[PDB]
Amino acid sequence: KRDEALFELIALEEKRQREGLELIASENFVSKQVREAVGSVLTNKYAEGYPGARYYGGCEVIDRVESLAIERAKALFGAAWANVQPHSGSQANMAVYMALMEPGDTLMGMDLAAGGHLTHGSRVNFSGKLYKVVSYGVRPDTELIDLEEVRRLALEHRPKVIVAGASAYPRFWDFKAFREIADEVGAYLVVDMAHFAGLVAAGLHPNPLPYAHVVTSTTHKTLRGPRGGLILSNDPELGKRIDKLIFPGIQGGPLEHVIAGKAVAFFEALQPEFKEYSRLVVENAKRLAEELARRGYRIVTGGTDNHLFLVDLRPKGLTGKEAEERLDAVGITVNKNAIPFDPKPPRVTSGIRIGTPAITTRGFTPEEMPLVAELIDRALLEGPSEALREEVRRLALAHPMP
Amino acid sequence: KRDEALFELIALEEKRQREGLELIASENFVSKQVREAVGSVLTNKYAEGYPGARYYGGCEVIDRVESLAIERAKALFGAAWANVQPHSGSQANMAVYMALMEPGDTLMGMDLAAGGHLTHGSRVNFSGKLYKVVSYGVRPDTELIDLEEVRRLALEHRPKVIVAGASAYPRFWDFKAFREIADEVGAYLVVDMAHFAGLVAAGLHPNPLPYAHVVTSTTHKTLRGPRGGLILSNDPELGKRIDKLIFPGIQGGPLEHVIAGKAVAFFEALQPEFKEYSRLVVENAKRLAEELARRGYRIVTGGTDNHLFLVDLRPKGLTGKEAEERLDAVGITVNKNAIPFDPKPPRVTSGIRIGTPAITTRGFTPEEMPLVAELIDRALLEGPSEALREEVRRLALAHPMP
């Protein structure tokens, strides 16, 4: 018997995605071929271990699939080693921390309120539970990272691992300087490029590979692949230690169907069209932030160098939670986000985060940003309304989905 | 541009699956509708948090999907609470350990050599790195667990957590006895039913829900669902604590496409046909074990109560490693497994584990077990040959995949 109830819900979700403007910076729309691989029979095989070194037999074809994903990842990012088995970005980070540190050691990452991710040292996350955390933020004036403040914190606290990269920082990272700082205290530099991995692949964002000891990432987000994790390094000796932490360290069997999807995603990222897409992603982000600033909205750091930006809603008397709800009411999805030196608690926040990778995949161009900017503005000032919801629907439907 | 290289490999793997006999106890073949859900657009949504309490907008449909999976899991197993977000079995156990123990605490599980799982205390696994481990095994004379030995160890080491459940134990578990032991020392009883979950759902195996404080499992294996984890309990308060460990504790965004697949698998398991399937799984295992005993092999414990059984190859002078290779050469996959107090090292062993869930899914019935037994025996005695490989191939092809 077919589970009609469940499939009816899947159809409702397709409709929602098609009829709205998805502006959550961490989302995107995978291609049909990525889905074809993820929904393949590769899920019926237990492949504990690594290619050529599996626990069980019958992995001759799976080994070629995994190997292909590994080599393409290496080729795509210019890395000497890769591990494509992490179930997620969080497991990728977990593995790296456990390979380089012992519980109790000191970890240094970006403060959550300044843009850091939960896995960069939050007390409610494994990172802040097993390790002593020291965070760095951004300057109160420019809202940019001050490298001398980072240097100071490193010398004072002597972290074993320093993490660069974030989930809500809209400017470029100076990886060379972060490596110099880590070298000053004998720490490992770990770059979590999950958010900008696609831009790095397209050559539109500095590559951390040569400067970081280890690089982690998600395969979804700007890389536009399936949901999963990835770990890279220019040092294969360090890589061997990390492989051991992924399995048998923290995971059991890998999701080989997902890994097949990663291989397809890397193949897609290697095509010239991916660079054109990535360029448009950034152009859309700059133009959209610009149009919102023209309407009186304050953009953190005054703009963006990547695919995302933050809007400070304090001057407008709106909390991030309220903005998110008013936009969601009309089909525009974003997520409330804390801003630097946010006076309000994380459950409420004073701003919203916006990203363009998803709408750019749907074919939106910089010339359409002024229109998107107008819908956001009205939803926030005039609030939800049927006429507004319809205008959003029509705009969305005029753009296809992969 | 289609990734022809990758898709050519997917076709080869399908051909491999069709033409061979999969006897690895942890394997199974999922239905078309389970793959359809896993390959759905639900992968495009970030949905951190839980139903009604997410960190992003646009989760209205996803909430109905996850709630559906939760409620079906509760009805299927007779539970008061459930968490369907774990990426795997390993993450389900990790979350439970971290919610119940602090690093340094003592964990008690079944010895890996006796049938326990990597996550039950192995030194190369996170369980053995973060916690002090005490292991229990089987008696050389009975080949079964000795509850008095378990009790003794418990009183002597005072573990914070006692894990029941294994990956290679062919008999029923006395959950009531285990809980009595746990109460006596003030420990939590955690049951990992990953392997036998499908049997529990079909009511063919004692249900651990009423006796354990927490129950973990995989959604694949005898439950025949997609690859992933699951947590259940009869205590909602404890459940709320475990929800926090899954997120924001150890994971980030859940795989909602996989959770949709879990919902479908639970739907399939709630149908009367699943009970007939599971009845056949157990009958095939008992019958195949009998047929092999009749042909000169010894069955550990003399038989089985579930879907798997251990073969002692000593009567025929073979090691598990050799048996594994000889079988693999003719398209029959099994895995080597130590027998109680194996005289051979662990990388060699004197036995093999055989499980019937996968062939049963393909339509094999008890009357055909004698034929599978003969093919296994001929491959081990005569060794691989083209003629034998063709006989396996034809038998396999005559039993379609889902």
Side-chain angles (χ1 to χ4, degrees), chain B residues 24-105:
Chain B
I24 287 162
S26 54
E27 305 284 37
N28 219 324
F29 297 107
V30 299
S31 68
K32 192 70 161 75
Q33 58 169 355
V34 163
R35 295 193 289 129
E36 192 184 319
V38 168
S40 77
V41 296
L42 276 60
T43 180
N44 297 321
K45 195 82 193 77
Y46 238 106
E48 294 177 332
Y50 290 95
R54 304 282 192 186
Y55 285 45
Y56 311 79
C59 294
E60 56 257 37
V61 182
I62 292 300
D63 284 357
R64 298 173 66 187
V65 172
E66 194 169 332
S67 297
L68 189 62
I70 292 170
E71 295 302 305
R72 291 179 174 176
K74 287 157 59 177
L76 181 57
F77 294 104
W81 166 89
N83 184 306
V84 295
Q85 292 186 28
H87 300 317
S88 64
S90 298
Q91 269 57 64
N93 294 344
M94 180 182 273
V96 175
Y97 293 174
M98 290 183 78
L100 305 183
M101 298 182 286
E102 279 299 295
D105 289 348

XYZ file of all heavy atoms in Angstrom, chain B residues 24-105:
618
model
N 24.174 -10.834 4.843
C 24.680 -10.053 5.978
C 23.467 -9.622 6.782
O 22.544 -9.024 6.238
C 25.559 -8.856 5.525
C 26.919 -9.380 5.034
C 25.725 -7.818 6.648
C 27.692 -8.385 4.180
N 23.433 -10.034 8.048
C 22.294 -9.814 8.935
C 21.780 -8.392 9.076
O 20.609 -8.186 9.408
C 22.590 -10.403 10.313
N 22.649 -7.413 8.870
C 22.243 -6.028 9.033
C 21.665 -5.407 7.777
O 21.329 -4.220 7.770
C 23.424 -5.199 9.502
O 24.508 -5.373 8.612
N 21.587 -6.179 6.703
C 21.100 -5.633 5.447
C 19.624 -5.875 5.190
O 19.002 -6.761 5.766
C 21.925 -6.192 4.276
C 23.429 -5.967 4.396
C 23.855 -4.539 4.085
O 23.128 -3.589 4.447
O 24.948 -4.364 3.503
N 19.094 -5.099 4.257
C 17.725 -5.227 3.813
C 17.585 -4.417 2.525
O 18.514 -3.729 2.113
C 16.728 -4.757 4.878
C 15.488 -5.650 4.948
O 15.011 -6.154 3.930
N 14.953 -5.832 6.149
N 16.417 -4.505 1.901
C 16.129 -3.771 0.672
C 14.870 -2.926 0.930
O 13.815 -3.469 1.252
C 15.898 -4.745 -0.493
C 17.100 -5.593 -0.832
C 17.123 -6.939 -0.508
C 18.203 -5.045 -1.478
C 18.226 -7.727 -0.820
C 19.310 -5.822 -1.792
C 19.319 -7.166 -1.462
N 14.991 -1.610 0.808
C 13.856 -0.712 1.042
C 12.918 -0.656 -0.158
O 13.304 -0.970 -1.286
C 14.312 0.718 1.397
C 15.146 0.707 2.669
C 15.115 1.330 0.243
N 11.678 -0.264 0.102
C 10.665 -0.180 -0.942
C 10.902 1.035 -1.824
O 11.657 1.947 -1.481
C 9.282 -0.039 -0.320
O 9.190 1.220 0.316
N 10.211 1.049 -2.949
C 10.290 2.151 -3.892
C 9.807 3.455 -3.224
O 10.413 4.508 -3.403
C 9.427 1.827 -5.120
C 9.630 2.751 -6.306
C 10.992 2.532 -6.963
C 11.025 3.092 -8.387
N 11.107 4.580 -8.450
N 8.706 3.392 -2.472
C 8.173 4.598 -1.837
C 9.068 5.178 -0.747
O 9.065 6.384 -0.526
C 6.726 4.426 -1.380
C 6.500 3.301 -0.407
C 5.116 3.341 0.204
O 4.339 4.270 -0.032
N 4.806 2.336 1.014
N 9.890 4.344 -0.115
C 10.833 4.856 0.884
C 11.922 5.669 0.152
O 12.282 6.777 0.558
C 11.464 3.726 1.725
C 12.726 4.215 2.447
C 10.453 3.192 2.730
N 12.415 5.137 -0.956
C 13.410 5.857 -1.730
C 12.832 7.150 -2.308
O 13.533 8.161 -2.401
C 13.956 4.973 -2.839
C 14.712 3.797 -2.271
C 15.525 3.085 -3.301
N 14.693 2.344 -4.232
C 14.796 2.443 -5.549
N 15.526 3.415 -6.086
N 14.151 1.584 -6.319
N 11.559 7.109 -2.703
C 10.901 8.270 -3.283
C 10.891 9.424 -2.276
O 11.174 10.569 -2.624
C 9.479 7.913 -3.730
C 8.825 8.981 -4.612
C 7.380 8.649 -4.973
O 7.093 7.470 -5.277
O 6.537 9.569 -4.957
N 10.592 9.113 -1.022
C 10.576 10.128 0.027
C 11.975 10.677 0.293
O 12.152 11.868 0.472
C 9.983 9.547 1.308
N 12.959 9.788 0.335
C 14.340 10.163 0.597
C 14.907 11.004 -0.528
O 15.741 11.869 -0.297
C 15.217 8.917 0.824
C 16.708 9.268 0.804
C 14.836 8.268 2.143
N 14.425 10.774 -1.743
C 14.887 11.561 -2.872
C 14.000 12.771 -3.134
O 14.032 13.329 -4.234
N 13.203 13.170 -2.142
C 12.287 14.295 -2.295
C 12.931 15.663 -2.059
O 14.075 15.765 -1.612
C 11.105 14.131 -1.347
O 11.473 14.476 -0.021
N 12.166 16.714 -2.347
C 12.641 18.087 -2.164
C 12.715 18.525 -0.709
O 13.119 19.642 -0.422
C 11.774 19.104 -2.925
C 11.853 18.865 -4.431
C 10.334 19.033 -2.451
N 12.329 17.653 0.211
C 12.369 17.996 1.629
C 13.797 18.216 2.106
O 14.012 18.841 3.133
C 11.653 16.948 2.488
C 10.134 17.132 2.596
C 9.473 17.061 1.234
C 9.543 16.090 3.552
N 14.768 17.736 1.332
C 16.170 17.931 1.657
C 16.537 19.409 1.588
O 17.529 19.833 2.185
C 17.050 17.199 0.667
O 18.408 17.406 1.008
C 16.873 17.679 -0.756
N 15.767 20.196 0.841
C 16.061 21.623 0.689
C 15.701 22.487 1.897
O 16.011 23.676 1.914
C 15.343 22.222 -0.529
C 15.784 21.613 -1.838
O 16.957 21.334 -2.051
N 14.833 21.426 -2.739
N 15.027 21.929 2.891
C 14.627 22.746 4.033
C 15.488 22.620 5.286
O 15.711 21.521 5.790
C 13.169 22.453 4.410
C 12.542 23.492 5.338
C 12.023 24.721 4.591
C 11.704 25.853 5.561
N 12.945 26.539 6.024
N 15.885 23.767 5.836
C 16.608 23.797 7.091
C 15.503 23.875 8.119
O 14.616 24.723 8.002
C 17.513 25.016 7.196
C 18.938 24.610 7.403
C 19.861 24.727 6.363
C 19.358 24.044 8.605
C 21.161 24.308 6.510
C 20.666 23.605 8.759
C 21.566 23.746 7.702
O 22.868 23.308 7.795
N 15.514 22.960 9.082
C 14.461 22.899 10.082
C 14.985 22.582 11.494
O 14.427 21.737 12.206
C 13.401 21.874 9.649
N 16.038 23.273 11.911
C 16.567 23.046 13.242
C 15.479 23.330 14.269
O 14.625 24.194 14.083
C 17.810 23.885 13.516
C 19.010 23.529 12.659
C 20.189 24.434 12.933
O 19.953 25.591 13.327
O 21.345 24.002 12.738
N 15.508 22.557 15.337
C 14.514 22.675 16.382
C 13.543 21.511 16.275
O 13.883 20.470 15.731
N 12.340 21.678 16.805
C 11.332 20.619 16.793
C 10.001 21.200 16.319
O 9.871 22.417 16.195
C 11.229 20.016 18.206
C 12.467 19.217 18.547
C 13.517 19.783 19.259
C 12.615 17.924 18.081
C 14.681 19.067 19.505
C 13.759 17.210 18.308
C 14.787 17.773 19.015
O 15.917 17.018 19.217
N 9.013 20.338 16.017
C 7.727 20.836 15.522
C 7.146 21.919 16.412
O 7.095 21.774 17.634
C 6.846 19.590 15.534
C 7.802 18.466 15.340
C 9.042 18.865 16.082
N 6.714 23.008 15.788
C 6.137 24.114 16.531
C 7.160 25.022 17.194
O 6.799 26.074 17.712
N 8.428 24.619 17.182
C 9.504 25.403 17.792
C 10.795 25.346 16.959
O 11.793 24.778 17.389
C 9.767 24.913 19.221
N 10.761 25.925 15.763
C 11.910 25.917 14.867
C 12.692 27.225 14.903
O 12.210 28.237 15.414
C 11.437 25.663 13.444
C 10.625 24.397 13.287
C 11.483 23.126 13.248
N 10.633 22.028 12.805
C 10.975 20.749 12.752
N 12.193 20.347 13.073
N 10.080 19.862 12.351
N 13.894 27.190 14.332
C 14.785 28.351 14.261
C 14.696 29.057 12.900
O 15.453 29.999 12.625
C 16.228 27.909 14.538
C 16.521 27.617 15.995
C 15.646 26.862 16.764
C 17.674 28.101 16.601
C 15.904 26.602 18.096
C 17.945 27.841 17.938
C 17.054 27.093 18.682
O 17.314 26.836 20.016
N 13.764 28.613 12.057
C 13.553 29.214 10.732
C 12.064 29.229 10.365
O 11.283 28.435 10.890
C 14.252 28.401 9.643
C 15.697 28.045 9.906
C 16.028 26.989 10.745
C 16.736 28.757 9.302
C 17.344 26.645 10.978
C 18.061 28.420 9.532
C 18.359 27.359 10.372
O 19.671 26.993 10.615
N 11.684 30.100 9.437
C 10.304 30.136 9.000
C 10.114 29.115 7.885
O 11.081 28.473 7.455
N 8.885 28.972 7.404
C 8.611 28.042 6.319
C 8.567 26.569 6.665
O 8.574 25.735 5.762
N 8.525 26.242 7.952
C 8.496 24.851 8.376
C 7.107 24.231 8.600
O 7.021 23.108 9.085
C 9.334 24.680 9.638
S 11.108 24.971 9.427
N 6.034 24.963 8.288
C 4.667 24.484 8.497
C 4.360 23.076 7.974
O 3.725 22.293 8.669
C 3.637 25.492 7.972
C 3.807 25.856 6.500
C 4.460 27.218 6.278
O 5.370 27.601 7.058
O 4.083 27.888 5.290
N 4.805 22.737 6.767
C 4.554 21.396 6.228
C 5.510 20.385 6.868
O 5.082 19.332 7.323
C 4.685 21.358 4.695
C 4.366 19.959 4.170
C 3.750 22.386 4.069
N 6.792 20.737 6.931
C 7.820 19.895 7.553
C 7.390 19.468 8.972
O 7.611 18.328 9.379
C 9.164 20.666 7.649
C 9.761 20.905 6.256
C 10.151 19.958 8.570
C 10.072 19.654 5.468
N 6.760 20.373 9.713
C 6.288 20.052 11.053
C 5.264 18.911 11.012
O 5.272 18.030 11.875
C 5.700 21.285 11.742
C 6.775 22.250 12.224
O 7.970 21.932 12.065
O 6.432 23.312 12.783
N 4.403 18.920 10.000
C 3.404 17.877 9.849
C 4.092 16.574 9.451
O 3.663 15.497 9.848
C 2.344 18.286 8.824
C 1.568 19.528 9.252
C 0.645 20.032 8.161
N -0.429 19.095 7.855
C -1.289 19.252 6.849
N -1.206 20.322 6.062
N -2.229 18.338 6.620
N 5.181 16.665 8.691
C 5.908 15.461 8.309
C 6.556 14.823 9.548
O 6.323 13.652 9.842
C 6.974 15.759 7.231
C 7.865 14.536 6.989
C 6.309 16.210 5.937
N 7.364 15.591 10.269
C 8.043 15.085 11.461
C 7.083 14.586 12.558
O 7.325 13.551 13.172
C 9.005 16.138 12.018
C 9.968 15.563 13.030
C 11.079 16.516 13.393
O 11.435 17.369 12.556
O 11.625 16.389 14.504
N 5.990 15.305 12.783
C 4.999 14.900 13.780
C 4.372 13.568 13.377
O 4.069 12.733 14.228
C 3.903 15.967 13.940
O 4.448 17.182 14.433
N 4.168 13.388 12.076
C 3.570 12.171 11.554
C 4.509 10.995 11.855
O 4.071 9.937 12.301
C 3.334 12.317 10.045
C 2.524 11.213 9.366
C 1.106 11.142 9.947
C 2.491 11.388 7.843
N 5.809 11.193 11.629
C 6.796 10.152 11.896
C 6.840 9.832 13.382
O 6.917 8.669 13.759
C 8.169 10.574 11.413
N 6.786 10.866 14.220
C 6.813 10.694 15.667
C 5.604 9.894 16.161
O 5.754 8.939 16.918
C 6.866 12.074 16.399
C 8.209 12.768 16.145
C 6.625 11.905 17.897
C 8.251 14.212 16.613
N 4.404 10.300 15.756
C 3.188 9.616 16.194
C 3.112 8.168 15.700
O 2.714 7.281 16.443
C 1.938 10.406 15.799
C 1.826 11.764 16.489
C 1.817 11.654 18.008
O 0.968 10.918 18.545
O 2.652 12.307 18.670
N 3.532 7.917 14.466
C 3.528 6.549 13.947
C 4.546 5.679 14.691
O 4.306 4.495 14.917
C 3.821 6.542 12.452
C 2.706 7.144 11.612
C 3.101 7.101 10.161
N 2.023 7.524 9.284
C 2.152 7.640 7.969
N 3.338 7.446 7.412
N 1.110 7.964 7.215
N 5.674 6.270 15.093
C 6.692 5.526 15.836
C 6.134 5.166 17.206
O 6.353 4.067 17.720
C 7.979 6.352 15.980
N 5.403 6.099 17.802
C 4.815 5.861 19.124
C 3.720 4.794 19.089
O 3.623 3.972 19.996
C 4.289 7.155 19.748
C 5.383 8.102 20.232
C 4.893 9.535 20.305
C 3.709 9.689 21.228
N 3.306 11.114 21.329
N 2.917 4.791 18.034
C 1.863 3.790 17.906
C 2.450 2.416 17.593
O 1.996 1.397 18.116
C 0.870 4.190 16.833
N 3.460 2.399 16.727
C 4.112 1.155 16.327
C 4.771 0.385 17.485
O 4.600 -0.828 17.604
C 5.144 1.438 15.231
C 5.920 0.250 14.647
C 4.966 -0.800 14.064
C 6.880 0.771 13.570
N 5.556 1.087 18.299
C 6.292 0.475 19.408
C 5.674 0.597 20.809
O 6.199 0.029 21.758
C 7.703 1.062 19.434
C 8.528 0.696 18.234
C 8.760 1.622 17.227
C 9.066 -0.579 18.105
C 9.516 1.280 16.113
C 9.821 -0.922 16.998
C 10.045 0.005 16.004
N 4.585 1.350 20.939
C 3.958 1.533 22.239
C 4.800 2.434 23.135
O 5.167 2.060 24.251
N 5.125 3.623 22.626
C 5.950 4.577 23.357
C 5.225 5.887 23.649
O 4.239 6.221 23.004
C 7.233 4.851 22.585
N 5.734 6.616 24.636
C 5.157 7.891 25.056
C 5.887 9.077 24.436
O 5.363 10.187 24.386
C 5.206 7.995 26.564
N 7.108 8.833 23.989
C 7.922 9.876 23.397
C 8.820 9.274 22.334
O 9.147 8.085 22.371
C 8.762 10.554 24.483
C 9.880 11.410 23.975
C 9.830 12.740 23.656
C 11.227 10.989 23.724
N 11.080 13.175 23.244
C 11.944 12.113 23.265
C 11.896 9.769 23.845
C 13.293 12.048 22.931
C 13.229 9.709 23.516
C 13.915 10.840 23.062
N 9.238 10.112 21.396
C 10.125 9.670 20.332
C 10.858 10.849 19.733
O 10.327 11.952 19.672
C 9.350 8.923 19.243
N 12.058 10.571 19.228
C 12.862 11.565 18.536
C 13.263 10.873 17.239
O 13.861 9.799 17.266
C 14.092 11.981 19.342
C 14.867 13.092 18.665
O 15.249 12.967 17.510
N 15.108 14.181 19.383
N 12.880 11.455 16.107
C 13.151 10.857 14.814
C 14.274 11.559 14.060
O 14.531 11.243 12.898
C 11.874 10.870 13.942
C 10.799 9.973 14.562
C 11.344 12.300 13.745
N 14.938 12.512 14.714
C 16.028 13.256 14.074
C 17.443 12.641 13.999
O 18.267 13.128 13.233
C 16.128 14.659 14.663
C 14.945 15.547 14.323
C 15.134 16.976 14.803
O 16.261 17.448 14.919
N 14.023 17.686 15.036
N 17.764 11.596 14.791
C 19.146 11.097 14.676
C 19.547 10.626 13.275
O 18.838 9.831 12.661
C 19.197 9.932 15.672
C 18.047 10.166 16.600
C 16.990 10.849 15.797
N 20.687 11.133 12.792
C 21.230 10.802 11.470
C 21.557 9.317 11.293
O 21.635 8.818 10.169
C 22.526 11.586 11.209
C 22.365 13.074 11.242
N 21.302 13.726 10.656
C 23.186 14.044 11.708
C 21.475 15.030 10.755
N 22.612 15.251 11.390
N 21.803 8.637 12.406
C 22.180 7.230 12.404
C 21.963 6.593 13.769
O 21.580 7.263 14.723
C 23.665 7.099 12.067
O 24.470 7.704 13.073
N 22.290 5.306 13.858
C 22.205 4.589 15.120
C 23.244 5.115 16.099
O 22.982 5.265 17.286
N 24.434 5.396 15.582
C 25.545 5.917 16.375
C 25.203 7.259 17.012
O 25.523 7.487 18.177
C 26.814 6.016 15.528
O 27.212 4.734 15.068
N 24.542 8.143 16.258
C 24.155 9.452 16.799
C 23.043 9.329 17.826
O 22.963 10.121 18.757
C 23.752 10.452 15.712
C 24.910 11.293 15.208
C 26.024 10.432 14.670
O 25.843 9.723 13.685
N 27.170 10.449 15.335
N 22.201 8.317 17.671
C 21.128 8.093 18.627
C 21.736 7.672 19.974
O 21.330 8.165 21.026
C 20.167 7.027 18.116
N 22.727 6.781 19.937
C 23.381 6.332 21.164
C 24.228 7.423 21.772
O 24.281 7.566 22.988
C 24.252 5.094 20.931
C 23.443 3.876 20.552
O 22.232 3.845 20.743
N 24.115 2.852 20.045
N 24.897 8.194 20.928
C 25.745 9.279 21.414
C 24.908 10.287 22.193
O 25.292 10.721 23.274
C 26.437 9.981 20.245
C 27.343 11.130 20.655
S 28.063 11.909 19.210
C 29.523 10.881 18.994
N 23.764 10.661 21.631
C 22.880 11.625 22.274
C 22.386 11.121 23.628
O 22.297 11.886 24.578
C 21.704 11.956 21.365
N 22.060 9.835 23.705
C 21.567 9.259 24.952
C 22.660 9.197 26.022
O 22.406 9.496 27.185
C 20.938 7.858 24.740
C 20.557 7.237 26.080
C 19.719 7.953 23.827
N 23.871 8.818 25.625
C 24.982 8.736 26.561
C 25.299 10.107 27.143
O 25.552 10.240 28.340
C 26.239 8.210 25.881
C 26.183 6.776 25.408
C 27.228 6.245 24.668
C 25.103 5.950 25.695
C 27.203 4.939 24.228
C 25.075 4.639 25.255
C 26.128 4.144 24.524
O 26.115 2.837 24.095
N 25.326 11.114 26.275
C 25.656 12.465 26.699
C 24.583 13.110 27.565
O 24.868 14.039 28.316
C 25.998 13.349 25.499
C 27.315 12.987 24.845
S 27.737 14.092 23.489
C 28.338 15.532 24.392
N 23.357 12.608 27.472
C 22.269 13.151 28.273
C 22.232 12.505 29.653
O 21.711 13.083 30.606
C 20.929 12.948 27.562
N 22.737 11.279 29.735
C 22.703 10.522 30.975
C 24.019 10.470 31.752
O 24.016 10.179 32.946
C 22.240 9.096 30.684
C 20.911 8.912 29.943
C 20.630 7.420 29.823
C 19.745 9.624 30.631
N 25.135 10.715 31.071
C 26.455 10.658 31.700
C 27.313 11.886 31.437
O 27.129 12.595 30.447
C 27.255 9.474 31.140
C 26.669 8.109 31.389
S 27.716 6.778 30.740
C 27.434 6.915 28.990
N 28.339 12.040 32.271
C 29.343 13.083 32.099
C 30.627 12.332 31.730
O 30.795 11.168 32.108
C 29.537 13.898 33.388
C 28.479 14.979 33.589
C 28.483 15.999 32.455
O 29.488 16.726 32.302
O 27.489 16.065 31.701
N 31.535 12.967 30.972
C 32.772 12.253 30.616
C 33.450 11.704 31.870
O 33.485 12.376 32.889
C 33.640 13.345 29.987
C 32.678 14.347 29.482
C 31.490 14.324 30.403
N 33.961 10.479 31.806
C 34.589 9.888 32.971
C 33.675 8.879 33.647
O 34.154 7.979 34.326
N 32.364 9.006 33.452
C 31.421 8.059 34.048
C 31.664 6.657 33.492
O 32.378 6.486 32.506
C 29.964 8.465 33.793
C 29.551 9.698 34.576
O 30.304 10.103 35.491
O 28.455 10.237 34.313
